[PDB]
Amino acid sequence: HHHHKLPEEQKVLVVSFDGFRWDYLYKVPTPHFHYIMKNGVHVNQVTNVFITKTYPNHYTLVTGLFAENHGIVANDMFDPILNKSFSLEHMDIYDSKFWEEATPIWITNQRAGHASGAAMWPGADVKIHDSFPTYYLPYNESVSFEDRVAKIIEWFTAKDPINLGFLYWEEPDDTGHDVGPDSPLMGSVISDVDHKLGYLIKMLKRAKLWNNVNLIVTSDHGMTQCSKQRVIELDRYLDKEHYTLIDHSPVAAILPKEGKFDEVYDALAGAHPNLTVYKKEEIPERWHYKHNDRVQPIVAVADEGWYILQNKSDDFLLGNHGYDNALAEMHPIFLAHGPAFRKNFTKEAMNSTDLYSLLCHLLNLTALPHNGSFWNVQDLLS
Ligand SMILES: *[C@@H]1O[C@H](CO)[C@@H](O[C@@H]2O[C@H](CO)[C@@H](O[C@@H]3O[C@H](CO[C@H]4O[C@H](CO)[C@@H](O)[C@H](O)[C@@H]4O)[C@@H](O)[C@H](O[C@H]4O[C@H](CO)[C@@H](O)[C@H](O)[C@@H]4O)[C@@H]3O)[C@H](O)[C@H]2NC(C)=O)[C@H](O)[C@H]1NC(C)=O
Ligand SMILES: *[C@@H]1O[C@H](CO)[C@@H](O[C@@H]2O[C@H](CO)[C@@H](O)[C@H](O)[C@H]2NC(C)=O)[C@H](O)[C@H]1NC(C)=O
Ligand SMILES: *[C@@H]1O[C@H](CO)[C@@H](O[C@@H]2O[C@H](CO)[C@@H](O)[C@H](O)[C@H]2NC(C)=O)[C@H](O)[C@H]1NC(C)=O
Ligand SMILES: *[C@@H]1O[C@H](CO[C@@H]2O[C@@H](C)[C@@H](O)[C@@H](O)[C@@H]2O)[C@@H](O)[C@H](O)[C@H]1NC(C)=O
Ligand SMILES: *[C@@H]1O[C@H](CO)[C@@H](O)[C@H](O)[C@H]1NC(C)=O
Ligand SMILES: *[C@@H]1O[C@H](CO)[C@@H](O)[C@H](O)[C@H]1NC(C)=O
Ligand SMILES: [Zn+2]
Ligand SMILES: [Zn+2]
Ligand SMILES: [Zn+2]
Ligand SMILES: [Zn+2]
Structure with a gap:
């Protein structure tokens, strides 16, 4: 019989599939992406930030800032005040001073008394302003998607549960570089990513989280075809x-x-x-x-x-990104499902700097100064 359920705090899980270009949804059947669309929201054209690389764009998602403001201007940088380099390729990313021109949302969330969890999200295993997410994994690309999901669900259902999770996966970016986004092999990796999304959905349902977590599925950038003739x-x-x-x-x-x-x-x-x-x-x-x-x-x-x-x-590489953020091929997917979100709604455009203000609104946090605008995205909400 119908009875009371205890009011839960609002919860958000942000999933980033690296390098998931906005139109990859249509390269192969993507039934699990489409399931979220049919029961959720979808934005056709997400303008991300220049340069359209991984570390600048993931830090924008958790700060609401342009790169000149949050300071993660590239994956490889030289800071003349620090007289230090930063390099993703050398995993030389752990110098806190490269991150401290801004404050990621997990710190703000935790200063408001909540707990956050991160499963391989770029920058989440770095000490920033003497803080980490409440729960995080040391970055290790070899950890399976299923193990990352297992940790996220453990944290959302712990004795002291998180209200904010970040989950990250390196495809379809890696294969897009290897074969180029025009390759018919992209269908295989996109199909696999859709299967992984279905796995996440199934585990969220099994854990009784599906209808109380706002699931946001996005990416940092797209991918374009390169050539030895160019x-x-x-x-x-x-x-x-x-x-x-x-x-x-x-x-x-x-x-x-x-x-x-x-x-x-x-x-x-x-x-x-x-x-x-x-x-x-x-x-x-x-x-x-x-x-x-x-x-x-x-x-x-x-x-x-x-x-x-x-x-x-x-x-x-046959695929690459980093180009002008006005270019459609650099733009990532964005879709979402949850109690805060409309169902079967499609919107033409958003700026990726707006996600931070959306997250702060959903979690009842006071946003730090940012470059986005909640009013631009309020029509995604129910
Ligand atoms: C890499 O860099 C190259 C070289 O700068 C860029 O190539 C230029 O691209 C522009 C835009 O398409 C070309 O300008 C357009 O040319 C069309 C005709 O193309 C043929 O004829 C010209 C000779 O005039 C050749 O150079 C060209 O290769 C073709 O043989 C015109 O139809 C266009 O006019 C129409 O559109 C413009 C707006 O684009 C309007 O203003 C006009 O009124 C008209 O409606 C236009 O003139 C230019 O010719 C290209 N140069 C060369 C050397 O090829 C690449 O775009 C760039 N690559 C990337 C990815 O950005
Ligand atoms: C993305 O951000 C840009 C820049 O803020 C937005 O463009 C502004 O839109 C306002 C209307 O709210 C205009 O008054 C300004 O003139 C625009 N500024 C510039 C520099 O063009 C744009 O609307 C945002 N896009 C989305 C989809 O939110
Ligand atoms: C993006 O947002 C940041 C944060 O509000 C803006 O940075 C501030 O800019 C003013 C100048 O108008 C400075 O006085 C402040 O010191 C800056 N604050 C920080 C934290 O950097 C920035 O101007 C915004 N960018 C755009 C293009 O609007
Ligand atoms: C600057 O620092 C150098 C040692 O650090 C290395 O080089 C710099 C340029 C960065 O790439 C950093 O990440 C490296 O670990 C010194 O050898 C050099 O003398 C220093 N220069 C000055 C002028 O102090
Ligand atoms: C290219 O530059 C690298 C330095 O990164 C150097 O070691 C290499 O020998 C150079 N190769 C050619 C063909 O010039
Ligand atoms: C990453 O995970 C794999 C699989 O458990 C393990 O073999 C490896 O030692 C871990 N650490 C690094 C830095 O790869
Ligand atoms: Zn990336
Ligand atoms: Zn990449
Ligand atoms: Zn990789
Ligand atoms: Zn490769």
Whole structure:
């Protein structure tokens, strides 16, 4: 018979499938994504932040800030005040000072008395302002999706449960790089990701969380097809001895050596039609990228689908991202299901800087100063 159920605090689980381009939903049958759509909300065009790389965009999701403000401007950075480098590829990400120009939402959540949990979310196993999420996993890409889900569900159902979870998975980004997003093999990995989403849905239902957790499924960026016929080779124009390459492609962050600034700029600007060379102060305002000492004196941006190689042996991948965030192929999926969200609703656009204000609203937190607007996304809510 129908009876009372104890009022639960509002809960949110944010899931990021890395590199899940907005239109991947249509490359193969995605019944579990479509199940969420039919019972939830879906935004066609999510404008993420420049540069359209993993660490800048995940930190935007948990701060509501543009990259010049939260300071995670790239996956590879050099901070001249710290005189230190940051590099994802070397797992050299744990220097707290690279993160401390902002405060991620899990800290704000916990300062309000709640508990947060993170299962491989970029930056969640880093000490920031002397704090971690209440529960987190040390980053390890080899941990299965099923084990990450198991931890999330354990934490949402613990003696002292979390109200806010973050779950992360490295596909379809990794395969998109390997084969290129135009490859028919992308169907296999997208289908697998849809199966993993179905596994998550099944476990949320089994744990009696499905109808009381607001599940948000999104990503950090998309992916575009590259080609060995679309390469810009810097050593055709520049003496490698006269600059340091802080980040390579498709946004080359260039630090000329002492006195070589005008040599480097003059040699590279207009050298190739698909490489736009900006002096820091000329960087487009719409990217909200330039007001930060981690933005190097010269930033050279390749057009969509072009690769910057410093020399003939530099890295090349059939898929890449990082390009202009106005480009549709850089845009991630966004869909959601839960008691706070409408059902079978589709909206054309959102800015990824708005998610932070949505999360703060759902959890009844006081948002720190940010660049998004709850009013832009209030129509997703029931
Ligand atoms: C990498 O960099 C290259 C080189 O800069 C860019 O290529 C240019 O792209 C633009 C935009 O499409 C081209 O301009 C358009 O050309 C069309 C005709 O193309 C043929 O003829 C020209 C010679 O005039 C050749 O260069 C070209 O290869 C083709 O053979 C025109 O129809 C277009 O005019 C129409 O659209 C424009 C708006 O785009 C309107 O203003 C017009 O009124 C008209 O309606 C336009 O002129 C340009 O020709 C290309 N240059 C070259 C050398 O190919 C790439 O776009 C860039 N790559 C990426 C991914 O950004
Ligand atoms: C994404 O953010 C931009 C920038 O804030 C929004 O563009 C502004 O929209 C307001 C209306 O609320 C206009 O008054 C401003 O002139 C716009 N500013 C700029 C710089 O264009 C945009 O609406 C947001 N998009 C979504 C889908 O939320
Ligand atoms: C994005 O949001 C941040 C936070 O509100 C803004 O940063 C502030 O900018 C003012 C100048 O208007 C400075 O006085 C503050 O010191 C900044 N605060 C922080 C925390 O950095 C930023 O201006 C916003 N960006 C845009 C493009 O609107
Ligand atoms: C700056 O620091 C150097 C040692 O640190 C390494 O190099 C810097 C540039 C960063 O890449 C950092 O992450 C590395 O661990 C010193 O060798 C160098 O002398 C220092 N320079 C000055 C001027 O103090
Ligand atoms: C990551 O997880 C795997 C599987 O349990 C384990 O073999 C490995 O030692 C872990 N640590 C790292 C740094 O990969
Ligand atoms: C390219 O640059 C690397 C440094 O990253 C250097 O070790 C390598 O020998 C260079 N290769 C060519 C072909 O110039
Ligand atoms: Zn990514
Ligand atoms: Zn990637
Ligand atoms: Zn990987
Ligand atoms: Zn690979």
